[PDB]
Design a protein around this ligand. Sequence first.
Ligand SMILES: Nc1ncnc2c1ncn2[C@@H]1O[C@H](COP(=O)(O)OP(=O)(O)NP(=O)(O)O)[C@@H](O)[C@H]1O
Ligand SMILES: Nc1ncnc2c1ncn2[C@@H]1O[C@H](COP(=O)(O)OP(=O)(O)NP(=O)(O)O)[C@@H](O)[C@H]1O
Ligand SMILES: N[C@@H](Cc1csc2ccccc12)C(=O)O
Ligand SMILES: N[C@@H](Cc1csc2ccccc12)C(=O)O
Ligand SMILES: [Mg+2]
Ligand SMILES: [Mg+2]
Ligand SMILES: [Mg+2]
Ligand SMILES: [Mg+2]
Lengths: 260, 260
Amino acid sequence: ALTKSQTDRLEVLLNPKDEISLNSGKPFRELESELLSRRKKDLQQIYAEERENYLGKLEREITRFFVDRGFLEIKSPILIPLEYIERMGIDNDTELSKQIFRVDKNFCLRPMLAPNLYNYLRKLDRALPDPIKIFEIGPCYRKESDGKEHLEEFTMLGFQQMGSGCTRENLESIITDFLNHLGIDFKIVGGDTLDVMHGDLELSSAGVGPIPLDREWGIDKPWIGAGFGLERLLKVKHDFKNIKRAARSESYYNGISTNL
Amino acid sequence: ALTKSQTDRLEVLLNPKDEISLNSGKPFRELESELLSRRKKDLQQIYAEERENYLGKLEREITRFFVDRGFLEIKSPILIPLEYIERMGIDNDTELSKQIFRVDKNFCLRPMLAPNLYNYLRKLDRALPDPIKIFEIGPCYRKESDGKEHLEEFTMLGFQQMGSGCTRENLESIITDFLNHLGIDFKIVGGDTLDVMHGDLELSSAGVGPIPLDREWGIDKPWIGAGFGLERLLKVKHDFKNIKRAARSESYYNGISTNL
Ligand SMILES: Nc1ncnc2c1ncn2[C@@H]1O[C@H](COP(=O)(O)OP(=O)(O)NP(=O)(O)O)[C@@H](O)[C@H]1O
Ligand SMILES: Nc1ncnc2c1ncn2[C@@H]1O[C@H](COP(=O)(O)OP(=O)(O)NP(=O)(O)O)[C@@H](O)[C@H]1O
Ligand SMILES: N[C@@H](Cc1csc2ccccc12)C(=O)O
Ligand SMILES: N[C@@H](Cc1csc2ccccc12)C(=O)O
Ligand SMILES: [Mg+2]
Ligand SMILES: [Mg+2]
Ligand SMILES: [Mg+2]
Ligand SMILES: [Mg+2]
């Protein structure tokens, strides 16, 4: 009989597509040797053939998808003024206030893309024709309780369109085309707001403006937008049991354990 | 005569390829109106035609270049244990110790890619055939004095090869092919170490191992590697006078002022 410690070890080495039962009559040492051999070969095949990281490749695919639909690619600061958090309406009553990684007296690791995207919408409205369509992909940071669906360091896609065409129907069409393009199953459930669910897992929250918060950011036009976690998309696509297999990590490469 | 404040404002709106003299007999208001019109049209052309961010696009081009040469694409944590810094031999005597953005009691924003790349080399050596070639592109953080060549939030390329073929000649060949591919002029000047210079500007530091530090990271094979700042490459390629035009920013998009 395997110990729970031994089964923990085998589960680290187990890939979703593996056809192995750890409840068999096989000794730990030889189940482990089998899985070690398979994972080494998996890494060898990646190194020989494609060599691209899941998170980088997904960012590049998403980037191509939004650029092709007319959205401008933004890369804004990850280290942001703490003031931006308060100006988003996040006060101690809100959950997110206690999730902030503070850095100095006045700065934090951004937990969200909305402040920077607001600032870009306001500035670009002076230069670009209506409608203004922008997106960003990059690191975001939140303190979280241990969870199979949460990372403290994750990667967010945020997109926003401002001006004409900012209907709920158009927002749902973007989301739907996007997830059908990636091959990810979803249901949309719904200051209009909606969530994009995969079972009980939240892939995205989306919104339709105007909302009263817009005025603090110098925004006075309708808008639609949404934010998606890349690691949650990878977790669904590859059927990972824990989102740590999709994270920036020293412990996993493309969902394969690096502790061999 | 223009005030220095007025010339500061015009210089924000001035692009390197602009054929305008601020030392002319033209009034500020109409020099400003001219440059505002040009910068709005520049942004309009980006939005109409390509829509890609300089920093994202450069990362993707570099990524294609190293993947095609057989390097595995790594995406490792940006928030790293503070311990990694000490284990790199960075003590109070070294300059970098006081440049660290600390986050909690035990974590920091990585100022460098070497710790994570060391850990990947050690782990992948159990699985991959000799030689082991890896690279990473992503955010790094250092506290710096105000400078035309330094950002506190920048983007690093780091690559490393371990095992056979780890000669200085091979390292110089990679660097040379890489910068000739990007169209960036350079001179290589030289525990063997060398710097890749563009005039007085350091594009890269590179190294040849083994070095004694390797043992602390579980490394006991020869290696070659280098690190490059992406914003410095953009600054050179686009002839920006200040590296802030190439940064993750709310103030510049592809080197164009967003304050129009
Ligand atoms: N800690 C996290 N780890 C991974 N992805 C995350 C995390 N927090 C948010 N995301 C993703 O970012 C999207 C937009 O953020 P947001 O709507 O603020 O999330 P949220 O409401 O806190 N979701 P949740 O914490 O799961 O109830 C989410 O739908 C997730 O896909
Ligand atoms: N603050 C920074 N802003 C932008 N790029 C940077 C910064 N620090 C380092 N880099 C880049 O990263 C490369 C490798 O880092 P490193 O060799 O540690 O730099 P460095 O020795 O501190 N260079 P410098 O500070 O200019 O004398 C450098 O050659 C630069 O291209
Ligand atoms: N609130 C999260 C997700 C998000 C980015 S743009 C955006 C627009 C509408 C809804 C959500 C988002 C965030 O601010 O990152
Ligand atoms: N020291 C910097 C640059 C770098 C990355 S891998 C590497 C290998 C050799 C020399 C430099 C580097 C760093 O650690 O990021
Ligand atoms: Mg949450
Ligand atoms: Mg949500
Ligand atoms: Mg320095
Ligand atoms: Mg150096």
